[PDB]
Amino acid sequence: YSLYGVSGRGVFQNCTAVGVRQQRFVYDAYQNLVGYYSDDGNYYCLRAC
Amino acid sequence: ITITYQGLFPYQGDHGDMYVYSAGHATGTTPQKLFVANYSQDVKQFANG
Secondary structure (H helix, E strand, O other), X not given: OOOOXXXXXXXXXXXXXXXXXXXXXXXXXXXXXXXXXXXXXXXXEOOOO | OXXXXXXXXXXXXXXXXXXXXOOOOEOOOOEOOOOOOOHHHOOOXXXXX
């Protein structure tokens, strides 16, 4: 993928359902994003390589 | 996720500044003088908001 200001390499899946949903990432306690948003409008949660 | 995070917050137990707005003077039929606190002369420092 290559999203807005963020790079990265991930395996998107239609996951559920944890986030903010108004701004459009979700991190897990580090710099990484685990990982949905951005698609319109679902939950494409990402993973590491 | 839980985390420690360093951002702009109010402090625990802060009573803050209280403000109240009031009905004005009135007769039975007619509003008269406004009724207010001295807030306009109390200029505060913005600092961090």
